[PDB]
């Protein structure tokens, strides 16, 4: 009745609306023409009108059809990686026929600190669609994806509806960040709602608590990102998992010299000829200032360098240029915090270096064994399961069978207790891939032979002394390369897998395929036995 | 009183309703004609009215009466299998007289990756009834099958009521997927509700929390599917179990060339003359790229091939056709991940190959035995029970009785400890069917005779050296065929069961019925003893 109800009514006629939009517009019209000073009644309908005007329809982004430009765009996002972009291109080709996905959503998984956001932005630019993000981590209620009931003012729509209202296109690139961090603790499981907004048979008629009228969401492209492969079962359908990994020394150096350095220089309001960093400084930072698979440490170190350089040049008008090399780098970072190289490790007896497979990239572990006098009981530490128990039992049996050859007293399992400690045993690794490590440590404790340093080993063991194949050799090799380990012992059955590993990692490490316990004991111990 | 209460009232008169529907309509009418702006009061009654209008009655699907068309439809679902479809036809014949089931629900069980959904859709098409699915896995509360109490808005009906409202027919095909995955952890056991909706004496008057008025559900046909035979006892009544199994090489090849390839080609938006795959590529994929009973691996590999072919042909306008054979297949899949054939296995002593019966299809296991110096204690690994203990004891007794004939020192059980390892001993197999395997491995450890490779064995043993019959020979034979094993040793009493196995599996394997331990020791060991 008042003037407000008139102006709002115009917002319904000044915007073109399809059948569903016309239906919700008619509903709002029936809800309009009422008293404007009505507390919590006119404001909610006004907000609904604004949302409808903001909801996209009869308009979309010009989606590109050529694939060459998509490849050229994907080649300049972070580094290219020559591995994941190819898969992306494949998906684009499958989508180069119709506007209907009818399949996966190109899910990305890997350790944090990689080009996930960069890949999403590159895909948005290649597809010619607007970019929009939404975080799935920490979500535990359907009230986060969907809105509230059609009631008094304050019942704002869900995050998805808000993002769609802000992005006035019917075919945007909706990114789903931290899908593995989503939980279900407030109102059932919100995964169902996600399915309703992701399944091509349900997104066309997706209904919201506030926007009860069905909205067409089949043209919206969705992309999910995660850190681990522990994606909920209902969210695993219609999804393709693409695993990402770390980078090598030269790869990280090129990445830093291509985007990290220019971005940090432009962010700190620096000039083109104010700071010059060579490759020696970056190498020193990667070797003694960061230990990870991503480039987060490099970014933080470059930011600190830029800030310190700006402060030093500002307080000294006589300084015209600042150059940081591999020698004065410490002057801006301090004492080194990490060690590179195992040449001066002073090889020990009870300690063994092994490779561990982790969902965020493999790492290095130092397993220990203690053989003290007792009655023969077995003790283990590191939150190990039954698999580790049977593996230790098999290793003990192998040691008992080869004690005569190794010079071990056959009565060691009767008058001496064994305690095996495996640090970070709760790693997301299904299977006791450290069998050879524990066996070598046991042989060392019983014989006193120090385990040769700068040597890494991983793989399963049997009761007859045979080595079984394992998975995730790329991550373990990358971890050994970052840790400065040159000698790596892997099972023989995994030799055929080396053909799928780039030469940049194999040319730096010395791999020796083994299949028996005697070979690992000969190549790992300092002496012959 | 307002205009809304009027329109809603019309929805009660514009739809024909039986006695029960008229009763719930009268209840809603008594609940209607109230204030429409009543928060959580008018919306719930409006939803109830919509549900009632959507609930089916006085309308049904034209159920077919002929059986020839049903057989023709069942012959084109996945492959036909010539085994389960027959049983289905039998059920249809029993149902070709009246619309009352009064019996089982045609429960299907088998390993994942088979034509379960295809069988359900084929049954729906043959019976002329609409198809609808509902997943039973993960259900742990009665609030999932039934609705909520008749209270404020938000108390939506159960999944069953929603499916019935969406499918406007009184006789639909309700599929119950993952019945073995259902649990009872939130509100008692929902199985009771299932019975109320499945028992012909209770479905006619099935009451819901939201739809408190009894609804006739006797004309609704129910079908359940599962993976294992561990169906809850209350849900086992009025149910017929139909077990499914894997497929052979030629069967999988025909299935891939009949539906997998066309479906994957149509899904990837491919043309009729864009990709051509021969039988060599499919054979190579089944032999070195997948090890299962279903066709999931084949589907994934064909999808990857189609995606790679689309990307390769799109980025190369000069390419007119892509042909993948048994040689260039690796170019699209990489290095082989599985091994086929045991000819180059390099027969070992302490290892023995055996067949294992599993609820999702039999598989191959490698049992090991270690004879180390000690006092004669017995150790076992693989989460074995008392049955395995008594079986190992019987095998040890047989070895002690035949040590003189086999050349074993009679004092082996007094100065040497034995450790038997059975990988994946927790298999759902009731009975130590690996007696001969453990006995042969023990004889090998004590004598050093390597067990001939490419040989499989399974069966029970006694104290006198007699072999007892076992069950599940089809699954074990299929596993041996997939693993590339030609020599299979089975008990003599099971010979009469070979007549129930198709020739496609027997013509590829060399079965030798045995009844004594001497025959298995002669046909399994490399030498005579």
TrEMBL record, chains A, B:
Q: Give the UniProt subcellular location, in the record's own words.
A: Cytoplasm
Question: Quick one: a GO biological-process term for this protein?
Answer: protein quality control for misfolded or incompletely synthesized proteins
Q: Where does ATP bind?
A: 110-117
User: Membrane-crossing residues?
Assistant: none
The molecular function GO annotations come to: ATP binding; ATP hydrolysis activity; ATP-dependent peptidase activity; sequence-specific DNA binding; serine-type endopeptidase activity
Active site per the UniProt annotation = 433, 476
Q: What is its EC number?
A: 3.4.21.53
The reaction(s) this protein catalyses: Hydrolysis of proteins in presence of ATP
**The organism sits in which domain of life?**
Bacteria
The conditions that induce or repress this protein are given as:
By accumulation of abnormal proteins, such as at high temperatures. Under stress conditions.
Please report the stretch or stretches of sequence annotated as the Lon proteolytic domain: 346-527
Activity regulation description:
Contains an allosteric site (distinct from its active site), whose occupancy by an unfolded polypeptide leads to enzyme activation.
For the protein in the UniProt heading, the enzyme class is: hydrolase
Q: Name one GO cellular component term.
A: cytoplasm
List keywords of the entry alphabetically.
ATP-binding, Coiled coil, Cytoplasm, DNA-binding, Hydrolase, Nucleotide-binding, Protease, Serine protease, Stress response
What the record says about family reads:
Belongs to the peptidase S16 family.
Subunit info? Homohexamer. Organized in a ring with a central cavity. ATP binding and hydrolysis do not affect the oligomeric state of the enzyme.
**Function per UniProt:** ATP-dependent serine protease that mediates the selective degradation of mutant and abnormal proteins as well as certain short-lived regulatory proteins. Required for cellular homeostasis and for survival from DNA damage and developmental changes induced by stress. Degrades polypeptides processively to yield small peptide fragments that are 5 to 10 amino acids long. Binds to DNA in a double-stranded, site-specific manner. Endogenous substrates include the regulatory proteins RcsA and SulA, the transcriptional activator SoxS, and UmuD.
The protein, known as:
Lon protease
Q: Which part of the complete protein is shown?
A: 262 to 790 of 799
